[PDB]
């Protein structure tokens, strides 16, 4: 109903902070509910990791899930998902102090689930 920011005034304290983004981002589709995200280690060794967030198209960016894997993980895997459902992927990478911006936004098409169905 109302709002009053009244110019952010927010205290922070930090060593360091992520600057630039992983480019070349792409994801490939493993399977219905299994798909890879690989993406380019930044120039900042600062990174603890990189979050890969994936939600589906109707689904909210905050209500989409989150998958933390080492910055070491030049890649990282999506369980859980559905099929022939449209997944906005998103990986970025960040530190327990400053946080950084999210790559470019992807959108990912996993395959048709099949099953014993006869006939």
Not at 7 to 17: E, K, M, P, R, T
Not at 29 to 38: A, F, G, P, Q
Not at 56 to 68: F, S
Not at 93 to 104: E, F, R, T, V
Request: charged content about 20%; hydrophobic content about 35%.
């Amino acid at each position: 109903g109302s709002s009053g920011s009244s110019g952010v005034a927010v205290i922070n304290s930090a060593q360091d902070a992520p600057s630039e983004a992983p480019t070349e981002v792409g994801v490939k589709v493993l399977s219905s509910s299994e798909i890879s995200v690989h993406w380019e280690h930044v120039l900042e060794k600062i990174v603890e990791s990189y979050q890969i967030r994936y939600w589906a198209a109707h689904d909210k960016e905050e209500a989409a899930n989150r998958v933390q894997v080492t910055s070491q993980e030049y890649s990282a895997r999506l369980e859980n998902l559905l099929p022939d459902t449209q997944y906005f992927i998103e990986v970025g990478a960040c530190n327990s102090a400053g946080c950084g911006p999210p790559s470019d936004m992807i959108e990912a098409f996993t395959k048709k689930a099949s099953g014993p169905s006869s006939g």
